[PDB]
Write a protein that binds this ligand. Structure first.
Ligand SMILES: C[C@@]1(O)OC[C@H](O)C1(O)O
Length: 316
């Protein structure tokens, strides 16, 4: 019969992380004979994503995979989708667990929070330090889950560190650069910026270069292709991510499994070419209390620390 149709929705288009995730989703679609539509708003917003969800539902799509800008903002549209039998998955940034079926997740908040703090500590290497957090928004699901854990870890394991500020760049290159320059100017006693956002990290690096700020540890999460110039110049020594192309791929393979009615309750696994096995984990892995039939989290097998040694191995 007519080929299945899956939508893959980023927080916004035109950012390398999301372009690369979309590439993985679309290549998986080709391998599986599924038509995958990559579409998102030009900036992150609830209305941008909600219209797309509603459009794809109204147009008869079989599954929608979305990286949510908000835990709650998409819920009415996603609940309508699920009421109509459209498979709903999140990837990257979750909604509330009751607003989707599966979350294709790069890592637990404990894992990702730990990565951020470990990267910072490796470079700071002193007990008394001043650190700034810098990411997209105070409401986005993923980054706030990770930052809560990173801040807890700092308070426990680095008691001499002071978090002097937490500011936001809203996935906007212009606003992010201005915010980063503002942090560096306002806090001359600053030892690290921790920037778990694909736009905030290069903005912080660029701000440090613009202001000729030296010996500032700048760590966070972004893509190798975006970060490579900053790593080459030495402004960023280390940052983290994961294979976002593979994440997009996994999301489409999981959606395919749902469309084929394969067993995907907590504990079940799924074979994916070039990856091996992925498994459905409980929602409690993300800190949620919610369990239901046909609902859980699929964790990526690995995350990656990038530095000068390995950055040229990766093209995304
Ligand atoms: C990489 C990241 O931190 O920046 C944009 C994404 O939503 C992300 O995973 O949060």
């Amino acid at each position: 019969g007519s080929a299945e149709r899956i939508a893959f929705i980023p927080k916004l288009v035109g950012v390398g992380f999301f372009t690369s995730g979309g590439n993985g989703a679309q290549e998986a679609g080709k391998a599986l004979g599924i038509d995958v539509t990559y579409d998102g708003p030009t900036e992150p917003s609830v209305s941008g994503q909600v219209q797309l969800v509603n459009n794809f539902v109204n147009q008869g799509y079989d599954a929608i995979i979305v990286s949510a800008v908000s835990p709650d903002g998409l819920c009415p549209a996603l609940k309508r989708a699920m009421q109509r039998g459209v498979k709903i998955l999140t990837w990257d940034s979750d909604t509330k667990p009751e607003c989707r079926s599966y979350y294709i997740n790069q890592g637990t908040p404990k894992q990702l929070g730990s990565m951020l703090v470990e990267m910072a500590a490796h470079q700071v290497d002193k007990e008394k330090a001043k650190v700034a957090f810098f990411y997209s928004s105070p409401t986005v699901t993923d980054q706030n889950q990770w930052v809560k854990e990173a801040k807890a870890k700092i308070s426990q394991e680095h008691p001499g560190w002071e978090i002097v500020t937490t500011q936001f760049g809203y996935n906007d290159a212009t606003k992010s650069l201005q915010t980063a320059e503002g942090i560096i100017k306002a806090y001359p006693d600053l030892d690290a910026i921790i920037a778990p956002d694909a736009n905030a990290l290069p903005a912080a690096a660029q701000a440090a270069e613009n202001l000729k700020r030296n010996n500032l540890a700048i760590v966070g999460f972004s893509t190798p292709n975006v970060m490579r110039p900053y790593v080459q110049r030495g402004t960023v020594k280390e940052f983290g991510l994961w294979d976002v192309v593979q994440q997009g791929k996994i999301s489409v393979y999981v959606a395919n499994a749902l469309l084929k009615n394969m067993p995907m309750n907590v504990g079940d696994s799924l074979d994916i070419p070039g990856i091996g096995k992925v498994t459905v984990s409980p929602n409690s892995e993300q800190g949620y209390h919610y369990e239901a039939k046909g609902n859980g989290i699929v964790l990526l097998p690995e995350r990656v620390i990038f530095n000068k040694d390995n950055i040229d191995k990766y093209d995304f």
